[PDB]
Design a protein around this nucleic acid. Sequence first.
RNA 1: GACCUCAAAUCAGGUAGGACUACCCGCUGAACUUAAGCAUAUCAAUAAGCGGAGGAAAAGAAACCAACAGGGAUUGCCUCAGUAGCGGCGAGUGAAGCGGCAAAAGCUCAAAUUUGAAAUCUGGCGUCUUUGGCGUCCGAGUUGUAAUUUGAAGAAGGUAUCUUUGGGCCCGGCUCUUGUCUAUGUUCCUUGGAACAGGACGUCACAGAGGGUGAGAAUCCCGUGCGAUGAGAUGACCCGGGUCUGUGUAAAGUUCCUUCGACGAGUCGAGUUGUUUGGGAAUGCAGCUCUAAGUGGGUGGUAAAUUCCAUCUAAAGCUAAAUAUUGGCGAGAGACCGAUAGCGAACAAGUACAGUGAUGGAAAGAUGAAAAGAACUUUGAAAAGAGAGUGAAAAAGUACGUGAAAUUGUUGAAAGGGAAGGGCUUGAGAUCAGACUUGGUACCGGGCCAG
RNA 2: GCCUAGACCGAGGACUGCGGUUUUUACCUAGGAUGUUGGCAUAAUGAUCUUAAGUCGCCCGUCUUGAAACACGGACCAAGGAGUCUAACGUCUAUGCGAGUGUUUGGGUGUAAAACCCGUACGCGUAAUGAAAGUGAACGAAGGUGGGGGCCCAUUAGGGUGCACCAUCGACCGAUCCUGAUGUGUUCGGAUGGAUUUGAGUAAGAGCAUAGCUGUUGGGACCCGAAAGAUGGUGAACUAUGCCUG
RNA 3: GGCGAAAGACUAAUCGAACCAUCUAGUAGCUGGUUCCUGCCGAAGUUUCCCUCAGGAUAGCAGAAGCUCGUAUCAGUUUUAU
RNA 4: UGCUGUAAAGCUGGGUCGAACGGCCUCUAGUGCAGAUCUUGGUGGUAGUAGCAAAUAUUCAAAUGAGAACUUUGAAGACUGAAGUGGGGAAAGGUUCCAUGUCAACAGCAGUUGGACAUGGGUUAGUCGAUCCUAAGAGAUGGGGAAGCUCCGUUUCAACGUGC
RNA 5: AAACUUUCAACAACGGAUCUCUUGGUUCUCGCAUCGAUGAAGAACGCAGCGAAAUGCGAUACGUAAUAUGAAUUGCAGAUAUUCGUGAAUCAUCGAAUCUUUGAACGCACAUUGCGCCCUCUGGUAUUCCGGAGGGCAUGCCUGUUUGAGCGUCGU
Lengths: 260, 148, 195, 125
Amino acid sequence: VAENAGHQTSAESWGTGRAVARIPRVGGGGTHRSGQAAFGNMCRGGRMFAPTKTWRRWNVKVNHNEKRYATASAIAASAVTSLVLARGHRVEQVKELPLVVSNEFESVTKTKDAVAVLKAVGAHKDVVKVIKSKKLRAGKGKLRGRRFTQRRGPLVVYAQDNGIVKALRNVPGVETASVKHLGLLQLAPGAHLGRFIIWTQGAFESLDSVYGSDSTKSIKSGYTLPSNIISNTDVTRLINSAEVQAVVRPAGEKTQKKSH
Amino acid sequence: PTRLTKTRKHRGNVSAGKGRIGKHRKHPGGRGKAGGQHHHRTNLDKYHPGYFGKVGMRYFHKQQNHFWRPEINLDKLWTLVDSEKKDEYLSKSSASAAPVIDTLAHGYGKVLGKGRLPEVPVIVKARFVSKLAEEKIRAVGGVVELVA
Amino acid sequence: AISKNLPLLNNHFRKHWQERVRVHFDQAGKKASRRQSRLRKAAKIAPRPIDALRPVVRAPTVKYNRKVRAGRGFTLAELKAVGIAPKYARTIGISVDHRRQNKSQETFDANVARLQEYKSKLVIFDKKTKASEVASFEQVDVSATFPVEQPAPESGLRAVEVPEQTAYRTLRLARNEKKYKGIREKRAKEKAEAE
Amino acid sequence: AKISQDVSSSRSKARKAYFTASSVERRVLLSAPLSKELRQQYNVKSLPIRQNDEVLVVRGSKKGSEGKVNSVYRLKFAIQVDKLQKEKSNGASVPINIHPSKVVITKLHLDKDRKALIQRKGGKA
RNA sequence: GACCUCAAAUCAGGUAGGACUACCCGCUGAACUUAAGCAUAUCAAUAAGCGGAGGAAAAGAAACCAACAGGGAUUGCCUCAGUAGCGGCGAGUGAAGCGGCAAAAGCUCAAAUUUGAAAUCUGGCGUCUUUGGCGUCCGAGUUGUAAUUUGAAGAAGGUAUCUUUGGGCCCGGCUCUUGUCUAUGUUCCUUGGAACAGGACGUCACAGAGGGUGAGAAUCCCGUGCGAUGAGAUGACCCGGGUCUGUGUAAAGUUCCUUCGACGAGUCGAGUUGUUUGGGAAUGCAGCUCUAAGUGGGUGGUAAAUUCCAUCUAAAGCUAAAUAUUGGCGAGAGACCGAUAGCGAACAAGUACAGUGAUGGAAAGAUGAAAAGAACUUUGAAAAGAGAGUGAAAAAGUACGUGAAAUUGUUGAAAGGGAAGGGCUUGAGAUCAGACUUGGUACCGGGCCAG
RNA sequence: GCCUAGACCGAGGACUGCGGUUUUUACCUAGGAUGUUGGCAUAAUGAUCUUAAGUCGCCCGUCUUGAAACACGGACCAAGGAGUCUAACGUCUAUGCGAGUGUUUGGGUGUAAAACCCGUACGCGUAAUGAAAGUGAACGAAGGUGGGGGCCCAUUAGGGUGCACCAUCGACCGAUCCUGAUGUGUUCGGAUGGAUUUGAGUAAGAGCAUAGCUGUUGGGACCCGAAAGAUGGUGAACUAUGCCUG
RNA sequence: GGCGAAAGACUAAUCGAACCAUCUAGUAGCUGGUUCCUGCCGAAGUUUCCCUCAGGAUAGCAGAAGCUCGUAUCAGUUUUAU
RNA sequence: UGCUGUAAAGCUGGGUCGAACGGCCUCUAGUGCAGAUCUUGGUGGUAGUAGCAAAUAUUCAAAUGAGAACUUUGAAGACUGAAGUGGGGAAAGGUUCCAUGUCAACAGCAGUUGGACAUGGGUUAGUCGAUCCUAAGAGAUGGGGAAGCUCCGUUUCAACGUGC
RNA sequence: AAACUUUCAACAACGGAUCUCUUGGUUCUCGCAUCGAUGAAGAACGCAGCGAAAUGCGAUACGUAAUAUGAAUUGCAGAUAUUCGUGAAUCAUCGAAUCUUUGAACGCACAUUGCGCCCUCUGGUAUUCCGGAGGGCAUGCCUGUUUGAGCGUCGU
Ligand SMILES: CN[C@@H]1[C@@H](O)[C@@H](O[C@@H]2[C@@H](O)[C@H](O[C@H]3O[C@H]([C@@H](C)O)[C@@H](O)[C@H](O)[C@H]3N)[C@@H](N)C[C@H]2N)OC[C@]1(C)O
Ligand SMILES: CN[C@@H]1[C@@H](O)[C@@H](O[C@@H]2[C@@H](O)[C@H](O[C@H]3O[C@H]([C@@H](C)O)[C@@H](O)[C@H](O)[C@H]3N)[C@@H](N)C[C@H]2N)OC[C@]1(C)O
Ligand SMILES: CN[C@@H]1[C@@H](O)[C@@H](O[C@@H]2[C@@H](O)[C@H](O[C@H]3O[C@H]([C@@H](C)O)[C@@H](O)[C@H](O)[C@H]3N)[C@@H](N)C[C@H]2N)OC[C@]1(C)O
Ligand SMILES: CN[C@@H]1[C@@H](O)[C@@H](O[C@@H]2[C@@H](O)[C@H](O[C@H]3O[C@H]([C@@H](C)O)[C@@H](O)[C@H](O)[C@H]3N)[C@@H](N)C[C@H]2N)OC[C@]1(C)O
Ligand SMILES: CN[C@@H]1[C@@H](O)[C@@H](O[C@@H]2[C@@H](O)[C@H](O[C@H]3O[C@H]([C@@H](C)O)[C@@H](O)[C@H](O)[C@H]3N)[C@@H](N)C[C@H]2N)OC[C@]1(C)O
Ligand SMILES: CN[C@@H]1[C@@H](O)[C@@H](O[C@@H]2[C@@H](O)[C@H](O[C@H]3O[C@H]([C@@H](C)O)[C@@H](O)[C@H](O)[C@H]3N)[C@@H](N)C[C@H]2N)OC[C@]1(C)O
Ligand SMILES: [NH3+]CCC[NH2+]CCCC[NH2+]CCC[NH3+]
């Protein structure tokens, strides 16, 4: 708010003994404003309690390594079909994830042709999901430049941009990203894992250079992919393994019988 | 965020957690470190002894750069050897060919003597050295070379 | 006012501090505009480099002796040794510093070497030079092409040579000699004059 | 999506520019599409409506009405077609205001300036 | 007849004042407040008051920093550092050097004999190719206007042959301003007063930003995106080519040798007084007293004398950029507010109104797509009513979107011996609900209340 | 031991148990209610609202030892209305990395305040102590003793190894007191050995960064409230006093 | 500051120091208020110091987070001995 | 109209209405009122109540009008009683003046009347004033202070005639 | 038993909450440098066919010229106003003008629509008196011109 809002009056308290509350009051006469209360957060036309300031903290620092961790985790989530379906993408008619498409798609220049490719590789149902999800926003946000809302579509990741970016700008819901600059806002929108990602072959073959492997250092200086604290995540197989079952006592009843 | 604060939980309770008798008032006890010698002496003498008074001598226009002398102990000294040739140096080093360790170029002012060296000759370059640090360096067959 | 076991703080907020708050909301905007200014300035004078060549100097202060950095300009002696007049050096992308002096040999040699490298890579165009040769060159980054390089610390292998006096004793004696120098040479006189 | 930094997506700015549009700006704002017949005749898609043009109404309660424009009432953002009237209970009649975006031009009123405009747009006169 | 000093003119030609406030350069200068009292201190070298600028200002090419192997005009950021220090050593307060980075740019006079030539300049008049050129005449000026030099040097004599070259214009480029031009459904069905809604079938898409249009419109309109093609203006102080004069025994640079090498005074500095500073036997500033020197002078953060060392070169001057910006002009935005909110003001708001005056200072947004703003008849003095009429709606009638509560009228039902209201329980009256199940195929079987 | 009159309840939901009777791999009263009959489903039944009756029931909020108070605020209704943000911090927790850690001053890049990338310094940590000049952390398996989870060897017990943590006797580094070797710018040096002394130290690092609640200090500082103090302006149309003209 | 045949009178309904705007949201150990539900735990008016006595700091009483362990030796109590 | 939850609350039937809105996972805050002699706005009881009582005083008839205690005309009864309830002005107001129309609001009853409302009309100077003179006083100018806004001086330390 | 009072429901009031919106505000960022004696900012009074405001303008008065553009304006009225065009409307653009009385505000004065003087032209038989039109007369300071003052002072 403005620093002087509610403070542009010369009001003073009447003090006590005039049978009114002790809040400051506008002086003078001849207008209905005369005698009215001023300055207080409870007063009409006063200043608000603790007026908002610009030096509130707006941006937040995150450790760069942890941010890279989250990026890697979101990339891994995009290859899990259950996560992609839970995230809401219409990937029921795609044979396998990751979906990798040939590099000829990096040179498509017209929107019609790019939509043809999306239909062919079975990603257009998710675009149709975006088209039919358009709604007027609920509440005063529509007064503030955020008039419509819709779902997010697929993310197309390329190694070379020979027209693919411009060919896809006008398609509702579709996002494009260079394989060199991938971020969490595109990978886990709303903090929800499992973005539908369409890799070109060049980008898919560049991933191992970008993030590194056992055989290849990351191009990120001094960076290595994170290790898990557990090596086999299927704990049921671990528990029901021959090593474990050889040292467990026989199990009791699932529910104890009522004895008394 | 405001939704997780206790201000939200105090809504509907008269005193906002500040008590009916005591009544959160403006500055009972004074502002800042007021009364450190009078009614806050029981805090300062207990938790901050030494607070009041003068000790030692003044130093006008103190330049902290005169006193720059980062310390490195002997137990850490081999970290300065190149990491790719450390294993080789530990085996091949002799009185006629020993590793040189330029501690000042690595940003250190004095070599201190905590810890134990590998039983391998070294040549240690330093601005300053402690008596025991040099004695331990000479005992594994090494030497300290003063640089400026 | 003073309460439970906590560090005593020094928060200097007793003036009208809120009248003097500078929030750098324009950090990204100034980055972008500073970048656009560099672009326009470089395009104005291409293929001439934007940066003048700078000398290499030792940093002062026993804390920063070990380091070497870029200086303000080459000395008059450094330019004299390469055969370049100070008023001419400014017209060919070489900085000049009439204030810096060359008391030693090492920095002088390093900068004379830098100047010779720059002169070897320099091409001065004239009215005979055609547009096709001017178009042949790309605007070179001078501070990247002639970087300031830290001399490498001594490493590798060398013979061990143990003096009989320890380094520690050498340092103690040097301190003692410095400390008592004044009074010992006062004693030397007053004993001598009494002879 | 817009890219130019000279272009604004502010709803308030757009509405203010529209409702404070001058008469000259309102002239272009009040454009009407040509019928497919005149579109294939003159090779132009839309033109600013003019007084002596002929239109077909293609939207609203008067869809199918044809007539000649009597006035371009720019202050009201509307055109008044010849015989499109509303009859009051007192027997007087008032014209029915129609927006140019809801009609198709059937015959153009031509002079040197309209012809020059058509030629500038890639048309033929 | 000069000169010096001093006047006058409606003399010829100029110039200054005042305004604006966000930032800028100074002067002047509080108290509230904190110290749990209070006077030094703090607030604060702040508010108020005064003088003076610009697009930035100021500062600026060391009388600097340092003490190192030394850096090298100024400014800003990060750091130094809540540190050295100051402080009823309490409350509090508080810089600098180094280091990384943004931006970088350098210079001008005075002090010198042109002395074989005042080589300089304002003005008048005439003239031209006019931000000026040429010619001429007064005047200024020797009590010093030009050329030549500025300490990094530099000068006068030689030197070695070297190395270099000014100006007048045309067209382009760049820069700015500006004109013109642009894809694809208004196809069918349903609802509706209106299709911009839903369904079907499509199209364009480097355009699915935004707005308009009778409801949520990429495809109806304006735009959006993409480019294309013209007109003008400006630039010693931006560069890319071309044109004619180069008055070049000239101007300049480089190297070597010899002799020299002018360098700012009531100032520096010292005392003292007041103020200020982190600056502590005194950080800067100012008043008064004293008042220099020439390897001199200043600084080197503890006063003094003695001896060294280091480092600059004051008392004269100019200068872009990086920096600031609640003002002015032009734009784009937001996890902001949504008519008691947000500026005081969304409206004929600094308005209406008050006060002698300085000043003080409101309330108040929305019929409908369209006025189609109710013709006509009738009762009434009229305002109005009743019919009628328009509209999707009058449960929209300019007392106009929705239309809560307090409060009030009428209608229905009920209760009522100096309050009323509440809990618990049941009756009475009213309302609500449920198993003959999603029942199964005359039978089977189930639901509820009870013995 | 036996007979006999009433009341309230029926939790659970295949089996599994303990017992009993035995006439039986059976049955029971023994690890919690079943059998049967009538009525009703146009309803006997249950809930709510209004009202009557019985019984109990002072007006809330607040300061207070004590309020229904002859203590204060409150006629009524709507809308507004009070622990916030920031700088720097303590504890705890989550997360990344770890003797390191922190990309974001800046540079690169961009689909352009985003996301993505880069590194020199710098901060904090990795060493302390002393006013300071200064000096600067292993006798030993980084020590001895008593406990100590877990692990190992047995075979209740017992034997071993024992991290974290705890009690205790030592050792190491700095400050203080003493001692005072070879030596010497003969006044310095400080070998060596001691001391109911002292430190925010050592003795196989634990930190740095982001975020969250709570707590702290400076800020208008939870909201409203003085009597005052200061700076710069405006008034002698009322009134006080002089003067001038009526 | 004025002005006062003097009442601290008068100085625009304002006078034991006018009015106006600003510093200023001046400070208050003092009075008033402080906005949803349920669940679990649950006080103190006492000690020491304070120009302290209507206020603070300090200890106590209270909550929260736990951590190391798992019957070790503990208790607002008795007995026996002293 | 019911249903769910111990509760904060959530859902639903009927009516009114007219353009946007909600569940779930998270983020964030100017996030929840009965009180503050709280703020602004709105509304009661009181209550058709207090009251509309100073300045001697009104009455008959006609006209007008829908309507007359209150307007107009006539008759009368009264009063101010020339130190006026008469006739003019200064200060102050600013069209209130006049004619015509006119009654929603105002004239604390009423209203056909009005200083109200609406539309027009109206203020004529050589001789009346202002204008000019000086009064107490105010105040430019050569100047002297003051950092300065400005203060001081007016017989003013001055080469002072827009002379006749 | 009514009236009266109280409670609820319906409808009607009173009032303007709620909901939906928004040519406004507020904050952030990006870019630019341009007030005035060549009379500014501000003030007063005027100006339209029918206007009180607001908006615009200055006796050339909701505007004149010019450039561009191309058929309106509109509440009503109305061209001696216009349409294949020197042409409707247009604060579209804007480089030429107009710009009352004032204001730093400049002949003097100003609580006055008060009072001079100079020049050119012009009316009343007029160098003088009375009238009209146009153009002038402030202060501080700079450079220069011209006319001067002082036994300050040189020479003859
Ligand atoms: C800067 N804002 C511009 C605004 O000036 C305006 O632009 C018009 C533009 O619409 C006109 O252009 C338009 O009208 C012309 C013609 C009928 O006049 C058509 O030929 C053309 O297709 C159409 N785009 C152009 N001729 C002039 C611009 N100032 O409208 C568009 C805009 C973006 O709002
Ligand atoms: C003719 N009388 C005018 C009248 O126009 C009035 O307007 C209000 C108008 O503001 C109200 O309309 C309102 O609508 C919403 C909502 C509360 O209804 C308000 O938020 C909004 O302020 C206002 N526009 C409307 N409902 C009634 C008119 N009398 O505004 C003032 C007035 C003098 O009373
Ligand atoms: C084992 N006991 C030792 C005790 O003997 C003493 O040791 C001293 C030591 O303090 C002396 O050392 C002392 O004095 C010298 C100075 C003389 O140069 C200083 O340099 C040194 O810093 C200082 N600690 C050392 N010179 C001799 C030891 N015996 O130090 C304390 C102790 C640890 O208790
Ligand atoms: C010089 N005499 C010593 C005597 O002083 C003592 O030595 C202490 C020793 O106990 C201290 O050490 C003490 O304090 C440290 C603490 C500081 O961290 C503890 O770690 C340690 O366990 C504890 N014993 C040590 N800090 C200094 C020696 N002089 O020990 C006995 C002795 C040998 O007689
Ligand atoms: C296994 N080796 C250990 C080694 O780890 C180390 O142990 C320390 C021990 O000495 C410390 O404990 C020490 O310091 C504390 C301290 C509070 O002053 C003293 O109270 C305690 O008496 C003293 N022993 C303990 N706090 C940590 C262990 N790692 O030092 C002792 C040791 C025996 O050499
Ligand atoms: C030494 N210098 C003095 C200088 O002070 C001055 O003297 C004045 C003198 O002129 C004044 O006197 C003057 O001014 C006054 C006026 C002020 O009223 C006149 O009345 C008087 O007639 C007139 N001579 C005298 N009153 C004071 C001296 N100091 O003028 C004369 C002088 C000799 O130059
Ligand atoms: N802003 C503060 C103005 C007053 N100055 C006082 C601060 C310095 C006081 N002197 C400190 C002691 C002298 N060195």
